[PDB]
Design an enzyme around this catalytic site. Structure first.
Site, short mmCIF file in Angstrom:
data_model
loop_
_atom_site.label_atom_id
_atom_site.label_comp_id
_atom_site.label_asym_id
_atom_site.label_seq_id
_atom_site.Cartn_x
_atom_site.Cartn_y
_atom_site.Cartn_z
N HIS A 54 0.84 -1.19 0.00
CA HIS A 54 0.00 0.00 0.00
C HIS A 54 0.88 1.25 0.00
O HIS A 54 0.69 2.11 -0.86
CB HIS A 54 -0.94 0.02 1.22
CG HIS A 54 -1.52 1.38 1.51
ND1 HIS A 54 -2.58 1.89 0.75
CD2 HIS A 54 -1.17 2.28 2.46
CE1 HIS A 54 -2.84 3.08 1.28
NE2 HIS A 54 -2.01 3.36 2.30
N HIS B 221 4.62 6.94 5.84
CA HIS B 221 3.38 7.08 6.62
C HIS B 221 3.09 5.60 7.03
O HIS B 221 3.61 4.68 6.35
CB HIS B 221 2.25 7.74 5.81
CG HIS B 221 1.40 6.79 5.02
ND1 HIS B 221 1.86 6.19 3.87
CD2 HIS B 221 0.13 6.35 5.25
CE1 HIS B 221 0.89 5.39 3.45
NE2 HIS B 221 -0.18 5.46 4.23
N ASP B 222 2.43 5.34 8.15
CA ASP B 222 2.23 3.93 8.54
C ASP B 222 3.46 3.27 9.25
O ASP B 222 3.25 2.23 9.87
CB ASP B 222 1.75 3.01 7.36
CG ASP B 222 0.32 3.13 6.80
OD1 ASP B 222 -0.49 3.92 7.37
OD2 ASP B 222 0.01 2.41 5.81
N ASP C 30 -2.42 9.41 -0.01
CA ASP C 30 -2.83 8.34 0.88
C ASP C 30 -4.32 8.03 0.72
O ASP C 30 -4.66 6.90 0.34
CB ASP C 30 -2.46 8.73 2.32
CG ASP C 30 -2.86 7.77 3.40
OD1 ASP C 30 -2.61 6.55 3.23
OD2 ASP C 30 -3.36 8.24 4.45
N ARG D 236 13.79 -11.73 33.11
CA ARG D 236 13.68 -12.52 31.87
C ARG D 236 12.88 -11.70 30.88
O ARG D 236 13.27 -11.68 29.73
CB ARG D 236 13.12 -13.91 32.11
CG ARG D 236 14.18 -14.94 32.47
CD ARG D 236 14.36 -15.22 33.94
NE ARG D 236 14.98 -16.52 33.95
CZ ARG D 236 16.23 -16.77 34.29
NH1 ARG D 236 16.85 -15.94 35.10
NH2 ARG D 236 16.84 -17.83 33.82
N1 LIG Z 1 -10.42 -3.78 8.70
C1 LIG Z 1 -10.68 -2.49 8.84
N2 LIG Z 1 -11.63 -2.10 9.68
C2 LIG Z 1 -11.94 -0.79 9.88
O1 LIG Z 1 -12.85 -0.47 10.65
C3 LIG Z 1 -11.14 0.15 9.13
N3 LIG Z 1 -11.20 1.53 9.10
C4 LIG Z 1 -10.31 1.88 8.25
N4 LIG Z 1 -9.62 0.83 7.71
C5 LIG Z 1 -8.39 0.97 6.92
C6 LIG Z 1 -8.51 0.94 5.41
C7 LIG Z 1 -7.32 1.80 4.96
O2 LIG Z 1 -6.25 1.03 4.43
C8 LIG Z 1 -6.79 2.39 6.26
C9 LIG Z 1 -6.32 3.81 6.30
O3 LIG Z 1 -5.95 4.06 7.65
P1 LIG Z 1 -6.29 5.20 8.55
O4 LIG Z 1 -7.57 5.03 9.17
S1 LIG Z 1 -4.59 5.17 9.59
O5 LIG Z 1 -6.29 6.30 7.53
P2 LIG Z 1 -5.56 7.70 7.51
O6 LIG Z 1 -5.68 8.36 6.22
O7 LIG Z 1 -4.11 7.48 7.84
O8 LIG Z 1 -6.00 8.65 8.70
P3 LIG Z 1 -4.97 9.07 9.83
O9 LIG Z 1 -4.63 10.39 9.95
O10 LIG Z 1 -5.62 8.49 11.02
O11 LIG Z 1 -3.79 8.40 9.41
O12 LIG Z 1 -7.87 2.23 7.19
C10 LIG Z 1 -10.17 -0.29 8.27
N5 LIG Z 1 -9.92 -1.62 8.11
MN LIG Z 2 -2.06 4.95 4.64
#
Ligand SMILES: Nc1nc(=O)c2ncn([C@H]3C[C@H](O)[C@@H](CO[P@@](=O)(S)OP(=O)(O)OP(=O)(O)O)O3)c2[nH]1
Ligand SMILES: [Mn+2]
Ligand SMILES: Nc1nc(=O)c2ncn([C@H]3C[C@H](O)[C@@H](CO[P@@](=O)(S)OP(=O)(O)OP(=O)(O)O)O3)c2[nH]1
Ligand SMILES: [Mg+2]
Ligand SMILES: [Mn+2]
Lengths: 503, 503
Positions: free
Chosen positions: A68, A116-117, A267, A441
C-alpha cells in the site's frame, strides 16, 4: 506570506549534519541519502508483515502496509510532479525558491509517502485501541482533569494528583493523558528519531508529521487548527525534538509542514480504490456486485456527474475489448486511472491555490475537502468499503483477535511496570537480578533499541528532582508501548501464544 | 545521428498505442503510466511472498524478493542519475537526444529494476531446477540434438524425432530444448506480455530483456555475443513478440537494450551486501566474525587500498560513539554507503565509456568487468556468502524441500500432459468431462489467466497443419510451467500439501 521553499526544504540533520553552501547537486545527494536510509530500513521491511484492511493474510495478491505504502508513493509522485509542472506553467517556480529544489520536493513527498504507517501498531486501529484501553484502566486520565481526586483511581501511586496543591500535578496530568493517547503518527516520529536513530533531514521528518496536536492535549482544540490537531501528532517524549523541528522548518506552534498535504492526499486517493480491488480478489463480492453497490451509494446523480466519467466509464470499458485482458482486472485498472486523472490534478491545483496558508502550515483543511464533487467520489469508495468490506465477519473476527493479542501481551509484561523505581533501575543496571527471575527474563525480551532509548532518556533526567520518579515511569511505559507497537501482526500473535504456552 | 536515445526510448505500445507528436510532458506521463501499471501489478505484489536467499522466512527483518527488488531500484536510480549527471558535464546530453528524455531514462531503469525478478519460480533456482529436471526426464532434449535417432527416450510420441527424416523434426528439436530451458528472465517477458497483458511501452519491455539467447538454442556458440546469450532470454512462444520488440527498439539480432546494463549492475551490487546483512540478523555469524571472513579474500597485496577503503573503513567507523546506533546496523550502513560510493561511479563511467557498443547492444560484457578492483570487491562479498551463508544447513534444507515441492506439483499435474490431443481439447471445450473427473478437476486448478493464454495461442494455430499437434503440446506444457512458476514459495508449498491430503 512570501513563499520561499528554500526556507522549508531543509537538508540539515539533527546529528553529524552536512554544513554550509552545498550546490544543487550536493543538496540532491543529501536527500538521495535519505531514500537509501529509508528503503534499506528494517522498519520499512517490517511493513510487508504489518496488515492493511485484511489481517494475517496469506494471499500475496492482497496488499500489506508495504505494498500500500508503495502505491501511495506513486500517487504522491504524480501529485508532486503535477504541482511542479503547474508552478512552472505559472512561472512561479523560480519565484517560490523551488527552481533548484525540484528533486528534493518530489523525493520528500515520495519518502514520507513510503514512511506514513511506519509507526502503526500490530493490529492497526485495534492495536491503538488495545494499548490505550489497557493504559486507560491502569492510570485514569479522566480523574486528572481538575485539582483534587478524592480517589483518582490511578493505580500508579506516583502519578496520583496529591492533593495537596502541586505544580508537579501538571506533569502527572500531561503523563497520564500522553500514555493513554498512543497514535501511529506520534509513534512514527518517535520511531524515526528516538528509536531507529535514522538521521533523516529535517525536511524529511517534517513530511511525516501529519498532526500538530501534542498527545497530552486535554481540552478542545483551537477553532483555527481543529483539523491539523485532529489526532495526536507527537508525544511528550518528543516535545523537544518537535520544538527543534519547528525551528528548523520555520513552523509556527501547531503548524504543519507544507509537503504533508501532498502525501496526505496521495494516501486517501490510493487506499480507497485499492481496498475494493482486494475485496473482489478475496471473493467478498463480484466486480458486477461492486458496481451496483457504488451506483446505489452515489447521490443519484447522474446527469452531470463525475460518477459517470469515472466509475461508469471504468465499468463500460471493462465489459468488452477487455477480451485482450480480464473483466475485473480491466475494471480496476480503469477505475484507478480515471480516479487519478480527475483527483490528482484537483489536488495539485488545490495545493497551488491555497499555497500561502499551506506554506504557513496554518491551512485548516485537506487538499480534497467537503465542497468538491472530487471529494464526494472518495467518500463514495470509503462508504462502499465501510458497509461491504470492513463489515465482513472474517475481517471483524481478526480485528477482535488482534485486540485480545495486544491486550494480552501488555498484561504479560505488566510486572515490569509493577516494579519499584529502585528495583527497576537495579534491573536496568545489573541486567540479570537474582530475586527477580521472571522480571529480568522479560526485561531481556524487550528489543535493545527500545531499552537503550529508556536508558538514554532517563540518564538525561536530574535524579535529585521530585519530577524524576514521574518521568522514569513515563519513559518505562513508553519503553513497553515501543516494544509492542514495534511488532508485526505475526510476531505479536506468535509472542502472545509462545508466552501463554499454547504453541 | 549515431547515439540518439530518441531512437531507443520508445513510448509507443503494442496494443492501443499513443500516436503522433506529444509534448516532453506528454511523453513523461506515458512512462509514468507504466510505473503505475507495474507498482499496482499483482505480479509485483506476489514478490513479498517469493524467496530471496532465506526460504519461507518468518522474520520481516529479512529481505523478500520485493524488498530486495526495491533496494535494486534505488541502486539503479543512483547509477541512472550519475550517468545523466556526467553526460550533462560532458555536454553530450543534448547531443545524444537525452536532453528531453531525462525522466524516462531514469524511470525505465527504476522500473525494470523492480521487475527484474517478476518471472522467477517459487524457491527459485531450485524451482528452475525442479521444472527443467522434471521436463528433461519426460522429453529428453539430449537425443534430439543429433541426426534422428532411432530410440530417443522422449515419452511424447508426437515430439519424438523421425527414424527416418523430415524438416518438421526441427520443430520437435526446438520444442524439446525450449521446454527443458525454463529461465525466470524468459518467463518474465512471457509474464509481462502474454500472461499479464500489461501493455507497457516498448522501451520498458526492452529493459527487462536481460539475455538475448532463444530458450531453444542448442548451439554451443556464438562468441561475440557469448555474454549476452549466457542464459535464455526468451521462449519459442514469444519469438514473434521479441521480433516486434527488436524492430521497435532498433535492436540487431541477439543485441540487448541500452538501459539493461544499468539495471544489471544495480542487481549485483545490491545482493552481495544485503545477504551478508541478513546472515548477521539470522545470527549465522556476528559482525566481528563477518569482518574476519572478508579479511581473507582481502587481498593484502594492496596493502592499504580498496578493502581498507570500503570494508576496513566501515569496520573502523562502527567502533565507539554511535549515538543509539547498534554496531551491527551502523557497520552495514557504512559498508553499503562505501560500496555504493565506489561502485556506482565506476558503473556510471563504464556505461559512458563504452556507450557506442552499449547503445548498439553489441557490448559483450557487464559494466563491472572482472579486470577491475571494483569487480573484485563484489566477488569478495559473493565468495563470503557462498562459503558461509548459502552453505548453512537451514538454508540448504529449505532448498532440498523446495525442490521436492515443485517436483511433486509437476508430478501431480502430469496426467494433464498425459491426455491425448482430442481428450485434452475436449476438456478445454466442455470445461467438465464426465470420463475424466481427476483431469477435469486438475484443469480447473490452473489459473484462468494461464488457461486463456493456452486457448488464445492454440486458437491462432492452423488446425490442418502437421505442426498443430506439436504446437498444441508445446503450449500445453507452457500452460503448466506458467501455473507452477506463477505461484509463491508459500502457495506452492500449501498446494503440494493440500493435493497430497496431508493438510
Ligand atoms: N479492517 C478495517 N476495519 C476498519 O474499521 C477500518 N477503518 C479503516 N480501515 C483501513 C482501510 C485503509 O487502508 C486504512 C487507512 O488508515 P487510517 O484510518 S490510519 O487512515 P488515515 O488516512 O491514515 O487517517 P490518519 O490520519 O488516522 O492516518 O484504514 C479499516 N480496516
Ligand atoms: Mn495509509
Ligand atoms: N540460498 C541460496 N542458495 C544458492 O545456491 C544461491 N545462489 C544464488 N542465490 C541467490 C542470492 C541472490 O540474492 C540471488 C540472485 O539471483 P540472480 O541474480 S542469480 O538472478 P537473475 O535476475 O537471473 O540474474 P542472473 O540470472 O544473471 O543471476 O541468488 C542463492 N541462494
Ligand atoms: Mg546478478
Ligand atoms: Mn536478483
Amino acid at each position: 506570506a512570501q513563499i520561499d521553499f528554500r526556507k522549508k526544504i531543509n537538508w540539515h540533520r539533527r546529528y553529524r549534519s552536512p554544513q554550509g553552501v552545498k550546490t544543487e547537486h550536493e543538496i540532491l545527494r543529501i536527500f538521495e541519502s535519505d531514500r537509501g536510509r529509508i528503503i534499506n530500513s528494517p522498519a520499512i521491511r517490517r511493513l510487508q508483515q504489518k496488515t492493511q484492511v485484511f489481517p494475517l493474510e496469506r494471499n500475496a495478491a492482497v496488499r500489506t502496509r508495504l505494498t500500500h505504502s508503495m502505491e501511495v508513493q506513486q500517487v504522491g509522485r504524480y501529485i508532486a510532479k503535477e504541482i511542479l509542472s503547474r508552478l512552472k506553467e505559472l512561472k512561479l517556480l523560480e519565484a517560490y525558491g523551488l527552481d533548484e529544489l525540484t528533486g528534493p520536493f518530489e523525493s520528500i513527498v515520495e519518502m514520507s509517502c513510503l514512511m506514513h504507517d511506519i509507526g502503526n501498531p500490530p493490529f492497526g486501529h485495534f492495536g491503538e485501541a488495545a494499548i490505550n484501553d489497557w493504559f486507560r484502566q491502569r492510570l485514569h486520565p479522566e480523574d486528572a482533569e481538575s485539582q483534587p481526586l478524592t480517589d483518582d483511581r490511578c493505580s500508579v501511586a506516583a502519578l496520583r494528583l496529591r492533593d495537596g496543591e502541586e505544580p508537579l500535578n501538571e506533569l502527572r496530568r500531561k503523563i497520564r493523558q500522553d500514555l493513554c493517547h498512543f497514535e501511529g503518527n506520534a509513534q512514527g516520529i518517535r520511531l524515526v528519531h528516538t528509536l531507529m536513530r535514522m538521521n533523516l533531514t529535517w525536511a524529511q521528518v517534517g513530511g511525516i508529521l501529519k498532526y500538530t496536536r501534542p498527545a497530552w492535549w486535554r481540552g478542545e482544540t483551537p477553532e483555527t487548527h481543529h483539523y491539523l490537531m485532529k489526532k495526536p501528532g507527537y508525544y511528550l517524549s518528543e516535545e523537544a525534538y518537535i520544538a527543534r523541528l519547528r525551528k528548523e522548518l520555520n513552523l509556527a506552534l501547531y503548524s504543519r509542514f507544507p509537503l504533508t498535504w501532498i502525501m496526505e492526499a496521495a494516501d486517501d486517493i490510493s487506499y480507497c480504490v485499492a481496498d475494493l480491488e482486494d475485496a473482489v480478489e478475496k471473493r467478498i463480492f463480484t466486480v458486477e456486485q461492486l458496481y451496483h453497490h457504488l451506483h446505489e451509494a452515489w447521490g443519484q446523480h447522474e446527469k452531470g456527474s463525475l460518477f459517470s466519467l469515472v466509475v461508469e466509464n471504468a465499468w463500460e470499458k471493462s465489459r468488452s475489448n477487455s477480451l485482450s485482458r480480464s473483466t475485473e482486472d480491466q475494471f480496476f485498472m480503469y477505475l484507478r486511472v480515471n480516479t487519478l486523472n480527475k483527483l490528482v490534478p484537483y489536488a495539485a491545483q488545490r495545493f497551488i491555490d491555497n499555497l500561502p496558508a499551506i506554506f504557513a502550515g496554518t491551512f485548516n483543511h485537506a487538499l480534497l475537502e467537503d465542497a468538491s464533487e472530487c471529494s464526494d467520489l472518495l467518500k463514495l469508495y470509503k462508504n462502499v468499503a465501510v458497509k461491504h468490506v470492513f463489515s465482513h465477519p472474517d475481517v471483524e473476527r481478526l480485528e477482535l483477535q488482534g485486540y485480545r493479542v495486544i491486550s494480552g501481551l501488555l498484561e504479560i509484561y505488566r510486572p515490569l511496570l509493577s516494579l519499584s523505581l529502585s528495583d527497576f533501575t537495579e534491573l536496568v543496571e545489573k541486567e540479570r537480578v537474582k530475586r527477580f527471575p521472571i522480571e529480568s527474563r522479560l526485561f531481556h525480551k524487550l528489543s535493545t533499541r527500545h531499552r537503550l532509548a529508556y536508558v538514554e532518556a532517563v540518564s538525561k533526567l536530574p535524579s535529585d528532582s521530585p519530577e524524576f520518579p514521574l518521568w522514569e515511569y513515563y519513559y518505562r511505559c513508553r519503553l513497553l508501548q515501543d516494544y509492542i507497537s514495534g511488532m508485526t501482526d505475526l510476531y505479536a500473535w506468535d509472542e502472545y501464544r509462545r508466552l501463554m504456552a499454547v504453541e
